[PDB]
């Protein structure tokens, strides 16, 4: 049933997730999230293949060469939330 929940807000999604937790539906949560993932959006997202692609993109951007990058290396909250290989590589770059 849950996958059909008419979520819109952030809270709606968090509710869904909370129910996936409460019932232990990691495959469901993984799917819901997959639906959410589908530049800023990509940054927010940062399955294995996708992560690899994101890594490659980051590398390309670095070779070509802001807040997100600093966080990887309001702000405190972001650092707390952040607290993977692709990410580490981008941070190194």
């Amino acid at each position: 049933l849950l996958p059909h929940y008419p979520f819109v807000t952030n809270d709606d999604i968090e509710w869904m997730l909370s129910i996936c937790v409460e019932w232990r539906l990691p495959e469901i949560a993984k799917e819901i999230y997959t639906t959410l993932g589908n530049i800023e959006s990509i940054a927010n997202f940062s399955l294995v293949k996708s992560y690899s692609w994101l890594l490659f993109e980051a590398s390309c951007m670095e070779g070509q060469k802001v807040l997100n990058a600093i966080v990887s290396k309001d702000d405190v909250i972001i650092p707390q939330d952040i607290l993977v290989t692709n990410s580490m590589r981008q941070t190194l770059a």
């Binding site: 290396k73 580490m88 590589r89 941070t91 190194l92």
Partner: peptide
Amino acid sequence: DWVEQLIL
């Protein structure tokens, strides 16, 4: 930490 993850 960031430089230990880059070396890995």
